[PDB]
Amino acid sequence: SSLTSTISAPASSTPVIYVFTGQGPQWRDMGKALYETESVFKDAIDHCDKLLANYFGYSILQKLRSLESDDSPEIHHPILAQPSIFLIQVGLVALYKSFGISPSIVVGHSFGEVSSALFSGVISLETAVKIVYYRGLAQNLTMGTGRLLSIGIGADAYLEKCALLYPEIEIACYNDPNSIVITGSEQDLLGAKSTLSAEGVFCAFLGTPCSFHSSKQEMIKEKIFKDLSDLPESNVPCVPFFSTITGSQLSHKGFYNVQYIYDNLRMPVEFTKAISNIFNFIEENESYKNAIFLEIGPHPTLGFYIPKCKPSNSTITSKPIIVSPLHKKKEELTQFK
């Protein structure tokens, strides 16, 4: 039941918060119906596609089309995975803008953070295009260098018992203290997951051959520091921006620099702290009493986290509504409607 509202009290234009997915799940046939039917979607898609092809040397859209299989692991390879997800993000948000919707608070996962800083009115479009180009090139040098695993337990148990068995694995993303993403050698992943299955708890593998926010991310630190040392100072966000680097809001002139980018690349993402502080900020105002989180992402994976992060002292009894427009196996058009 979603055609009819369930509200019973008057209001005016409850604001939304743009939840941006990470560089995780994806597939070959993104946005085909939206591209072939929605006009503004196609226009923004082609604009950003030409912008990125200026540096990649080829059109990213039909490049994603060129895959002969819906699931080839090279789709998870960052030199292809960053631009496709960025394209989908910009297309979806432009379509939302043409519908009259605007973000009020912006937050982004491991990859979507750059698009968050973009759509917060902080960085320019060309700056974002160059950033994603060079970051795709940088993450191209972490291909095959260790893999990731999404876990089915909390961080507390893992640090209490499982941390000292393999002191070579980092935790790249702290979604919530019931399921997080780890990063390191695949043998440590296999041993830890086999022990967890012996303990009876489920876990899910990941097809990415990368290691995000690990030791290897520092080998190209000099190259990234030279590539991105040309950015005009990042603007103060007229639309409040939440940083998932430390999981707290940061907003002043020049807080989003190459140092910030490297911290993104290396320091793991404290997503739980970010979302909890979003909820505290919501309760700390009155015009922000409701905010349907809008998960701009081709696969619903961050609504998996947000409701579980609602603070312990939450007098707001209403469940944070999560709306994912795109899920891979469904009809994109009707899901968007």
UniProtKB/Swiss-Prot annotation:
Disulfide bonds: none annotated. Induction: Up-regulated by P.aeruginosa, PAO1 strain and PA14 strain infection and down-regulated by phagocytic stimuli and growth on bacteria. Modular protein that is responsible for the completion of one condensation-processing cycle. The beta-ketoacyl synthase region is responsible for the actual condensation reaction while the acyl/malonyl transferase region is responsible for incorporating carboxylic acids units onto an acyl carrier protein (ACP) domain. The gene is pks16. Encoded by one of the numerous copies of polyketide synthase genes and clustered as a pair pks16/pks17 in chromosome 2. It comes from Dictyostelium discoideum (Social amoeba). Probable polyketide synthase. The active site is at residue 110. Residues 100-133 are annotated as: Acyl/malonyl transferases. This is Probable polyketide synthase 16. The lineage of its organism: Eukaryota, Amoebozoa, Evosea, Eumycetozoa, Dictyostelia. The chain holds residues 532 to 868 of 2603 of the full protein.
